[PDB]
Design a protein around this ligand. Structure first.
Ligand code: HEM
Ligand SMILES: O=C(O)[C@H](Cc1ccccc1)NC(=O)[C@@H]1CCCN1C(=O)CCC1CCCCC1
Length: 453
């Protein structure tokens, strides 16, 4: 079979389709028209977007296909370098950093991060308890305050103090603005064109700002010698079992920047979409709220109580199904291969998994694919392989998966314990696209159940 292509614009091929501020959603719409695979060409590039479990399950075969750095990720690499996220599997720092960090990110390691997560989560509850009767909550803004603070604290024992601020830490304004530049470059048919000279100068200032503060953090920590139970000590002491070598100071910088990207962008989105789904599905919110009141019997949640929030966990899963906050990943073909019996690929050939489209595959999920029903996760083993991929695939999957689900489960649990929620504006979903997806302008009112901490 020849695969379909969306509409073209002469010599620019498909590229002007990305000239939008919601490219993932535009790509989702192309998928609905064209189906499970389409070719997408730009000057000097060709990719193929997959939306079906049928084909993505083969693309997740690690013997045929490896992680590719998409143009987006190549642009993030300018400041995230060879941290785990923007490195190639065959880079020495990939495997090395991977071997050292895996035990820091285990489900086991969560027990030790738990108390710092609680620290930030209670800040959130206390903010909301202290709001006046007239006031509402700006949802993604508060969730981002939470998740950023949480990774700051468990990452290297730094307090961004986001709940004490109206405007973001100097580091974040740079970080956010750099991610911004990295994504906007995607669209420019002619960079090096002078109209972008300010953008480039800015970027360099931003990279600089991020580097200085992180390098200073690593410096101050070594010079102090203290052994806090955070990722930075794990990295400063750790040795790769394989090579026997530790990470160098520069790579450690890259890891910290990477985790700060993750903690800002992705986990906050999950929590935002979850609360959105809950207020638009009152019977579901009530069921989650009943679980929370039953399980969270203590002034503050234990590690083990969080593991008991099963329905909360299903809610997070279903939010991730409909709106995977990291919406795509890239692969290349290790060798010449035939995809799904029909599409012959050459070595080096690129693929893109369109996760939200995958999660809409009616052959997997049934006809009610658009409905918010967390119960569809009620027995996971009934799910076909590679159907649900909000965390990526294989060895290059998200290392912070367990971190993110524990944080989210804790925070949502507490939220459902402490407040009733009201969709007071009848919010119409508007999805903002950065490196990630967020519900822009989502606001609610909370009303305290007056349960003390
Ligand atoms: C709910 C929140 C999150 C979602 C949906 C998510 C999703 C993903 C996805 C899809 C990838 C792979 C991207 C690719 O193949 O190109 C990934 C990789 C990664 N994530 Fe996450 N992530 C989340 C939170 C976090 C957290 C909290 C951390 C840790 C601070 C983190 C650290 C990473 C790292 C380091 C990688 C690269 C792993 C490697 O290649 O060795 N993420 N994540
Ligand atoms: O960055 C790319 O290479 C392509 C866009 C593209 C395709 C062909 C030609 C030029 C650009 N990326 C995409 O399809 C989508 C659309 C824009 C953003 N995007 C992404 O790749 C998402 C960026 C990251 C990837 C890893 C997990 C977190 C999110």
């Amino acid at each position: 079979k020849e695969m379909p292509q969306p509409k073209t614009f002469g010599e620019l091929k498909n590229l002007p389709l990305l000239n939008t501020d919601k490219p993932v959603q535009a790509l989702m719409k192309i998928a609905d028209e064209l189906g499970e695979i389409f070719k997408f060409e730009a000057p000097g590039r060709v990719t193929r977007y997959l939306s079906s479990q049928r084909l993505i399950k083969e693309a997740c075969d690690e013997s045929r296909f490896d992680k590719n750095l998409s143009q987006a990720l190549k642009f993030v690499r300018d400041f995230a370098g060879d941290g785990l996220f923007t490195s190639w599997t065959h880079e020495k720092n990939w495997k090395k950093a991977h071997n050292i960090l895996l035990p820091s990110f285990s489900q086991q390691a969560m027990k030790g991060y738990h108390a710092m997560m609680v620290d930030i989560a209670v800040q959130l509850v206390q903010k909301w308890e202290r709001l006046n009767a007239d006031e509402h909550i700006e949802v993604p803004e508060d969730m981002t305050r939470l998740t950023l603070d949480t990774i700051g604290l468990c990452g290297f024992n730094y307090r961004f103090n986001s709940f004490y601020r109206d405007q973001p830490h100097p580091f974040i304004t740079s970080m956010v603005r750099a991610l911004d530049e990295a994504m906007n470059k995607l669209q420019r048919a002619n960079p090096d064109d002078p109209a972008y000279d300010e953008n480039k100068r800015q970027f360099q200032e931003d990279i600089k700002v991020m580097n200085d503060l992180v390098d200073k953090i690593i410096a101050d920590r070594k010079a102090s010698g203290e052994q806090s139970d955070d990722l930075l000590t794990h990295m400063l002491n750790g040795k790769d079992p394989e090579t026997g070598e530790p990470l160098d100071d520069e790579n450690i910088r890259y890891q910290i920047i990477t985790f700060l990207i993750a903690g800002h962008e992705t986990t906050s989105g999950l929590l935002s979409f979850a609360l959105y789904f809950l207020v638009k599905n009152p019977h579901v919110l009530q069921k989650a709220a009943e679980e929370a009141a039953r399980v969270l019997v203590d002034p503050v949640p234990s590690y083990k109580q969080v593991k008991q929030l099963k329905y909360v966990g299903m809610v997070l899963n279903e939010a991730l199904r409909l709106w995977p906050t990291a919406p795509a990943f890239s692969l290349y073909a290790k060798e010449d291969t035939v995809l799904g019996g029909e599409y012959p690929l050459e070595k080096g050939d690129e693929l893109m998994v369109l996760i939200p489209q995958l999660h809409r595959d009616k052959t997997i999920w049934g006809d009610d694919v658009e409905e918010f029903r967390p119960e569809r996760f009620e027995n996971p083993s009934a799910i076909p392989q590679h159907a649900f991929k909000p965390f990526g695939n294989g060895q290059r999957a998200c290392i912070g998966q367990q971190f993110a689900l524990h944080e989210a489960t804790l925070v949502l649990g507490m939220m459902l314990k402490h407040f009733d929620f009201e969709d007071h504006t009848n919010y119409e979903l508007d999805i903002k696209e950065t490196l990630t997806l967020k519900p822009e302008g989502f606001v609610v009112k909370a009303k305290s159940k007056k349960i003390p901490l």
